[PDB]
Amino acid sequence: EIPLKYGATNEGKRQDPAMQKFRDNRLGAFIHWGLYAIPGGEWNGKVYGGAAEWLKSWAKVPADEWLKLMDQWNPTKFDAKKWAKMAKEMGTKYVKITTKHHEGFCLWPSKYTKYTVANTPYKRDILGELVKAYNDEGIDVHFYFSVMDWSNPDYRYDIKSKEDSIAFSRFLEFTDNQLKELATRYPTVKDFWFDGTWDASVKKNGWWTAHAEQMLKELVPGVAINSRLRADDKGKRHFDSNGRLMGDYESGYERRLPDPVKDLKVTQWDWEACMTIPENQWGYHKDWSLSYVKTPIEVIDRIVHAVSMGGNMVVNFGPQADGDFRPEEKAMATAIGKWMNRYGKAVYACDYAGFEKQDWGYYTRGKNDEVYMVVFNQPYSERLIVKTPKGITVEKATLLTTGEDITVVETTRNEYNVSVPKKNPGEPYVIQLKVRAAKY
Numbered sequence: 001e002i003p004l005k006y007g008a009t010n011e012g013k014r015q016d017p018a019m020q021k022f023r024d025n026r027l028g029a030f031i032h033w034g035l036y037a038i039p040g041g042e043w044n045g046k047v048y049g050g051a052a053e054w055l056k057s058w059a060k061v062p063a064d065e066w067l068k069l070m071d072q073w074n075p076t077k078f079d080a081k082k083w084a085k086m087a088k089e090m091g092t093k094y095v096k097i098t099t100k101h102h103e104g105f106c107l108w109p110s111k112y113t114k115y116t117v118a119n120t121p122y123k124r125d126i127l128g129e130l131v132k133a134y135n136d137e138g139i140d141v142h143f144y145f146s147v148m149d150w151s152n153p154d155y156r157y158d159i160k161s162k163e164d165s166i167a168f169s170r171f172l173e174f175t176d177n178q179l180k181e182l183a184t185r186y187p188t189v190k191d192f193w194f195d196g197t198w199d200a201s202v203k204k205n206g207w208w209t210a211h212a213e214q215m216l217k218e219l220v221p222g223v224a225i226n227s228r229l230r231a232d233d234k235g236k237r238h239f240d241s242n243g244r245l246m247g248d249y250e251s252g253y254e255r256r257l258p259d260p261v262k263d264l265k266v267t268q269w270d271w272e273a274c275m276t277i278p279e280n281q282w283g284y285h286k287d288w289s290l291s292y293v294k295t296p297i298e299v300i301d302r303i304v305h306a307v308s309m310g311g312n313m314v315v316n317f318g319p320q321a322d323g324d325f326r327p328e329e330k331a332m333a334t335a336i337g338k339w340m341n342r343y344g345k346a347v348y349a350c351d352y353a354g355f356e357k358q359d360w361g362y363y364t365r366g367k368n369d370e371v372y373m374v375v376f377n378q379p380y381s382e383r384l385i386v387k388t389p390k391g392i393t394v395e396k397a398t399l400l401t402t403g404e405d406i407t408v409v410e411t412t413r414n415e416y417n418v419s420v421p422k423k424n425p426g427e428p429y430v431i432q433l434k435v436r437a438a439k440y
């Protein structure tokens with residue numbers, strides 16, 4: 001067992017009310033909005049296929065020229081109340097907002113740099129408007145923050161000289177300052193989600209990552225901090241040199257998910273996944289025909305998958321430069337909202353059920369030991385196999401929407417055939433099981 005000063009703090013899952021809320025929420029939205037929304041993946045007449053928020057990198061644009069996009073930042077159609085209504089209608093219980101992406105442009109008027117919304121034609125504190133509007137709908141607000149900053153010349157990718165160390169030390173102070181500023185300007189913030197912490201410079205400064213976590217927790221009671229921030233004494237990221245999770249929840253599942261049979265270890269800690277609608281576009285890209293775009297059901301499948309393994313899911317949106325959402329994203333939010341309004345008893349405040357995975361879909365477990373079968377793949381056999389853990393029996397099955405009774409036939413010790421509904425629901429659907437544990 002290795003000695004560590006900057007390794008894991010928490011033993012298991014936090015069980016204070018603020019973390020229980022973080023968890024019970026389950027479904028969130030991600031907002032990526034920054035200067036990248038203006039070119040929308042096109043630079044100097046060339047459309048790049050890579051992630052639009054990385055266009056500065058793909059098109060090799062220098063900082064001074066990239067940040068000159070500030071002069072066109074004037075989202076006339078922006079309306080924070082509209083945004084919050086859209087999130088409410090989607091059924092999202094929280095929103096994660098890009099306060100500052102890699103480009104360094106801040107969506108709040110930071111006093112620690114000139115590359116902020118204050119020095120744009122628009123001028124207004126976009127972040128503060130969003131915080132207020134989402135909080136007015138009862139939606140928690142989480143802050144995405146990129147440590148890596150392409151606008152600050154003191155940033156370093158690695159520490160290869162005493163000059164690199166000096167510059168980077170200044171950079172970390174600048175970062176602390178921005179963070180303290182965010183925490184105190186917007187004290188309803190529930191989470192900081194760090195990105196851009198993979199460079200060797202950061203891995204070599206584990207002490208700073210632990211310090212940032214302690215500092216923010218002192219400033220914001222009950223705040224959650226993601227594992228991605230954290231590096232230990234040895235530069236091991238997410239989980240420390242003793243394999244213990246750092247931060248409050250695991251945050252590595254980006255555009256992919258743990259395997260439902262092979263990655264059951266994830267059920268031992270809190271975790272959150274994120275995803276994109278296209279293959280890899282977080283910021284607004286003007287041409288979505290360049291990669292596969294997920295359908296609503298494909299998105300709903302990933303949401304439920306996450307919850308079935310004890311994790312949250314955050315679906316991403318990349319608003320237009322004008323401050324409105326593109327029509328594909330409006331259609332997505334409305335379709336997810338419709339399905340959650342009907343079946344969201346199986347999602348909100350649900351967790352891992354402890355049952356062996358079956359082909360038809362996923363199980364989730366409610367707060368009162370309800371076991372929901374969320375069916376995505378309808379068997380031609382008309383029978384949904386349910387294999388119970390030791391000592392567990394199924395006393396009843398009920399179609400969630402209609403209350404109708406569903407026949408349960410015992411086929412072996414520990415296994416049943418739960419019939420499909422008499423009328424095919426025509427969409428992914430929920431059967432609620434009543435289970436009993438012998439003297440869950």
Ligand SMILES: C[C@@H]1N[C@@H](CCCC[C@@H]2N[C@@H](C)[C@@H](O)[C@H]2O)[C@H](O)[C@@H]1O
Binds near residue numbers: 051054198254274282
């Ligand atoms: C949440 C998403 N994170 C950003 C993509 C991060 C890519 C991470 C890759 N892995 C590192 C080790 C680097 O090689 C970097 O390319 C996206 O722009 C979104 O903000």
